PDB file of C-alpha atoms in Angstrom:
ATOM      1  CA  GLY L   1     -12.304 -18.017   2.473  1.00 17.28           C
ATOM      2  CA  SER L   2      -9.804 -20.697   1.165  1.00 16.44           C
ATOM      3  CA  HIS L   3      -6.782 -19.968  -1.076  1.00 14.21           C
ATOM      4  CA  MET L   4      -6.094 -16.793   0.780  1.00 14.69           C
ATOM      5  CA  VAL L   5      -3.277 -15.497  -1.547  1.00 13.61           C
ATOM      6  CA  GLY L   6      -5.839 -15.624  -4.414  1.00 16.39           C
ATOM      7  CA  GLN L   7      -7.285 -12.692  -2.700  1.00 15.43           C
ATOM      8  CA  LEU L   8      -4.518 -10.245  -3.469  1.00 17.29           C
ATOM      9  CA  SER L   9      -3.352  -8.920  -6.833  1.00 20.06           C
ATOM     10  CA  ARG L  10      -0.222 -11.165  -6.951  1.00 22.90           C
ATOM     11  CA  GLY L  11       2.286  -9.463  -9.305  1.00 26.17           C
ATOM     12  CA  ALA L  12       0.756  -6.044  -9.017  1.00 26.40           C
ATOM     13  CA  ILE L  13       3.823  -4.663  -7.306  1.00 26.75           C
ATOM     14  CA  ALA L  14       6.175  -5.701  -9.959  1.00 32.65           C
ATOM     15  CA  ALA L  15       3.758  -4.338 -12.482  1.00 29.72           C
ATOM     16  CA  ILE L  16       3.709  -0.958 -10.562  1.00 31.56           C
ATOM     17  CA  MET L  17       7.561  -0.606 -10.350  1.00 31.38           C
ATOM     18  CA  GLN L  18       8.662  -2.257 -13.655  1.00 36.04           C
ATOM     19  CA  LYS L  19       5.731  -1.163 -15.974  1.00 35.16           C
ATOM     20  CA  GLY L  20       4.482   1.714 -14.240  1.00 36.11           C
ATOM     21  CA  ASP L  21       0.824   1.275 -15.240  1.00 36.73           C
ATOM     22  CA  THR L  22      -1.541   3.342 -13.124  1.00 36.83           C
ATOM     23  CA  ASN L  23      -4.684   1.960 -14.881  1.00 35.81           C
ATOM     24  CA  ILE L  24      -4.655  -1.048 -12.475  1.00 38.64           C
ATOM     25  CA  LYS L  25      -6.700  -1.193  -9.209  1.00 38.90           C
ATOM     26  CA  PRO L  26      -5.061  -3.771  -7.369  1.00 41.58           C
ATOM     27  CA  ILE L  27      -6.019  -5.752  -4.195  1.00 41.31           C
ATOM     28  CA  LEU L  28      -3.186  -5.447  -1.608  1.00 41.84           C
ATOM     29  CA  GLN L  29      -2.708  -6.279   2.272  1.00 39.70           C
ATOM     30  CA  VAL L  30      -1.401  -3.672   4.626  1.00 39.75           C
ATOM     31  CA  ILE L  31       1.453  -5.446   6.646  1.00 37.46           C
ATOM     32  CA  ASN L  32       2.421  -2.201   8.585  1.00 38.64           C
ATOM     33  CA  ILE L  33       1.980   1.550   8.929  1.00 37.05           C
ATOM     34  CA  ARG L  34       4.064   4.228  10.869  1.00 35.77           C
ATOM     35  CA  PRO L  35       4.285   7.868  10.778  1.00 37.54           C
ATOM     36  CA  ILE L  36       7.021   9.692   9.203  1.00 35.19           C
ATOM     37  CA  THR L  37       9.029  12.417  10.669  1.00 37.51           C
ATOM     38  CA  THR L  38       7.622  15.583   9.528  1.00 37.28           C
ATOM     39  CA  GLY L  39       6.972  19.398   9.883  1.00 39.69           C
ATOM     40  CA  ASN L  40       5.438  21.799  10.714  1.00 38.86           C
ATOM     41  CA  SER L  41       2.650  19.875   8.700  1.00 38.07           C
ATOM     42  CA  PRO L  42       0.157  17.237   8.863  1.00 40.12           C
ATOM     43  CA  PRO L  43       1.301  13.793   9.824  1.00 40.84           C
ATOM     44  CA  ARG L  44       2.272  11.329   6.913  1.00 43.40           C
ATOM     45  CA  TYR L  45       1.942   7.672   6.859  1.00 43.51           C
ATOM     46  CA  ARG L  46       4.206   5.068   5.402  1.00 45.16           C
ATOM     47  CA  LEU L  47       2.790   1.667   4.434  1.00 47.85           C
ATOM     48  CA  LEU L  48       4.579  -1.851   3.895  1.00 48.98           C
ATOM     49  CA  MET L  49       2.002  -3.489   1.662  1.00 48.94           C
ATOM     50  CA  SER L  50       1.968  -6.898   0.143  1.00 49.59           C
ATOM     51  CA  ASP L  51       0.387  -8.336  -3.152  1.00 45.14           C
ATOM     52  CA  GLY L  52       1.100 -12.017  -1.934  1.00 43.58           C
ATOM     53  CA  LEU L  53       4.393 -12.335  -3.783  1.00 41.62           C
ATOM     54  CA  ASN L  54       6.178  -9.192  -2.910  1.00 39.75           C
ATOM     55  CA  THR L  55       6.142  -6.431  -0.098  1.00 39.36           C
ATOM     56  CA  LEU L  56       7.218  -3.108  -0.907  1.00 38.39           C
ATOM     57  CA  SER L  57       7.591  -0.225   1.953  1.00 39.01           C
ATOM     58  CA  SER L  58       7.783   2.876  -0.399  1.00 40.27           C
ATOM     59  CA  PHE L  59       3.841   3.397  -0.329  1.00 35.17           C
ATOM     60  CA  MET L  60       2.808   6.699   1.337  1.00 36.56           C
ATOM     61  CA  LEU L  61      -0.811   7.690   2.153  1.00 32.45           C
ATOM     62  CA  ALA L  62      -2.150  10.858   0.598  1.00 30.76           C
ATOM     63  CA  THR L  63      -2.742  13.260   3.659  1.00 32.93           C
ATOM     64  CA  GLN L  64      -6.545  13.544   2.519  1.00 32.45           C
ATOM     65  CA  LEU L  65      -6.565   9.656   3.730  1.00 29.89           C
ATOM     66  CA  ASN L  66      -5.198  10.304   7.293  1.00 30.97           C
ATOM     67  CA  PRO L  67      -8.427   9.772   8.733  1.00 30.37           C
ATOM     68  CA  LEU L  68      -8.598   6.068   7.783  1.00 33.11           C
ATOM     69  CA  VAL L  69      -5.491   5.514   9.737  1.00 36.24           C
ATOM     70  CA  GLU L  70      -6.634   7.847  12.875  1.00 32.76           C
ATOM     71  CA  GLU L  71     -10.091   7.264  12.867  1.00 32.06           C
ATOM     72  CA  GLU L  72     -11.529   4.150  11.023  1.00 31.88           C
ATOM     73  CA  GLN L  73      -9.506   1.070  10.116  1.00 34.54           C
ATOM     74  CA  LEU L  74      -6.943   1.134   7.749  1.00 36.60           C
ATOM     75  CA  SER L  75      -4.526  -0.982   9.800  1.00 37.79           C
ATOM     76  CA  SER L  76      -2.105  -3.959   9.859  1.00 40.62           C
ATOM     77  CA  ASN L  77      -3.634  -7.086   8.104  1.00 41.69           C
ATOM     78  CA  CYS L  78      -6.349  -5.193   6.346  1.00 38.60           C
ATOM     79  CA  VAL L  79      -7.085  -6.058   2.666  1.00 38.34           C
ATOM     80  CA  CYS L  80      -7.473  -2.876   0.454  1.00 34.34           C
ATOM     81  CA  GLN L  81      -8.251  -2.130  -3.260  1.00 33.15           C
ATOM     82  CA  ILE L  82      -6.146   0.699  -4.471  1.00 34.02           C
ATOM     83  CA  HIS L  83      -8.613   2.844  -6.805  1.00 34.97           C
ATOM     84  CA  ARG L  84      -6.287   5.708  -7.505  1.00 36.37           C
ATOM     85  CA  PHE L  85      -2.289   6.031  -7.255  1.00 37.00           C
ATOM     86  CA  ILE L  86       0.509   8.053  -8.667  1.00 37.91           C
ATOM     87  CA  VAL L  87       4.241   7.181  -8.654  1.00 39.84           C
ATOM     88  CA  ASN L  88       6.707   9.948  -7.603  1.00 38.36           C
ATOM     89  CA  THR L  89      10.582   9.772  -8.196  1.00 39.39           C
ATOM     90  CA  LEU L  90      12.873  11.680  -5.930  1.00 43.66           C
ATOM     91  CA  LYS L  91      16.087  13.206  -6.773  1.00 40.38           C
ATOM     92  CA  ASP L  92      18.087  10.239  -5.765  1.00 40.58           C
ATOM     93  CA  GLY L  93      16.226   7.886  -7.989  1.00 39.14           C
ATOM     94  CA  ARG L  94      13.808   6.236  -5.269  1.00 39.59           C
ATOM     95  CA  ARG L  95      10.169   6.094  -5.948  1.00 36.56           C
ATOM     96  CA  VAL L  96       7.373   6.689  -3.905  1.00 35.16           C
ATOM     97  CA  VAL L  97       3.891   5.397  -4.517  1.00 33.73           C
ATOM     98  CA  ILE L  98       1.453   7.713  -3.288  1.00 34.83           C
ATOM     99  CA  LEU L  99      -2.065   6.257  -2.478  1.00 34.87           C
ATOM    100  CA  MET L 100      -4.802   8.751  -3.344  1.00 33.04           C
ATOM    101  CA  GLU L 101      -7.988   6.553  -3.179  1.00 35.15           C
ATOM    102  CA  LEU L 102      -8.520   3.411  -1.565  1.00 31.85           C
ATOM    103  CA  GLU L 103     -11.298   1.128  -0.117  1.00 34.17           C
ATOM    104  CA  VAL L 104     -11.015  -1.384   2.517  1.00 34.78           C
ATOM    105  CA  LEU L 105     -12.284  -4.657   1.520  1.00 33.67           C
ATOM    106  CA  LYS L 106     -11.639  -6.688   4.670  1.00 33.47           C
ATOM    107  CA  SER L 107     -11.103  -5.344   7.967  1.00 34.19           C
ATOM    108  CA  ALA L 108      -7.723  -6.384  10.093  1.00 35.09           C
ATOM    109  CA  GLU L 109      -9.575  -8.008  12.464  1.00 34.63           C
ATOM    110  CA  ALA L 110     -11.504 -10.039   9.608  1.00 34.15           C
ATOM    111  CA  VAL L 111      -8.268 -11.061   8.175  1.00 30.68           C
ATOM    112  CA  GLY L 112      -5.942 -11.466  11.114  1.00 30.30           C
ATOM    113  CA  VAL L 113      -2.690 -12.697   9.697  1.00 28.19           C
ATOM    114  CA  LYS L 114      -0.349 -12.019   6.999  1.00 27.71           C
ATOM    115  CA  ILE L 115      -1.356 -13.879   3.862  1.00 28.62           C
ATOM    116  CA  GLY L 116       1.034 -15.935   2.143  1.00 26.49           C
ATOM    117  CA  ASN L 117       4.793 -15.573   2.094  1.00 25.22           C
ATOM    118  CA  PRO L 118       5.675 -12.325   0.359  1.00 24.68           C
ATOM    119  CA  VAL L 119       9.213 -11.285   0.038  1.00 24.51           C
ATOM    120  CA  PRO L 120      10.957  -7.698  -0.392  1.00 24.11           C
ATOM    121  CA  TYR L 121      10.719  -6.080  -3.717  1.00 26.13           C
ATOM    122  CA  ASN L 122      14.079  -5.310  -4.642  1.00 26.10           C
ATOM    123  CA  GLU L 123      13.683  -1.754  -6.131  1.00 27.55           C
TER     124      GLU L 123
END
């Protein structure tokens, strides 16, 4: 409906990367998904996600959720609630947000556009 940016958890990305709270179950929009180069092992998917204010490209899907991308519709423009995630920190200091459980609330086709005008979060 109206006020589309009100559908997203504005401020959740800052909360995740500044406060590190994991109890939140934020609603985010998928902007893009791409495979990352891997083994030797199951494919891995990286996501550019938006909370309406910011985008962040450091999300990775847990491999158990790969069928959502391959088979169902987790795809660009869909709106999703993150039910479980963890943050992992690399040796170099970068952080990765691993999505463990998520629910598609609205399909890509039902949303159809990038909501709002989010800007990149500066890690």
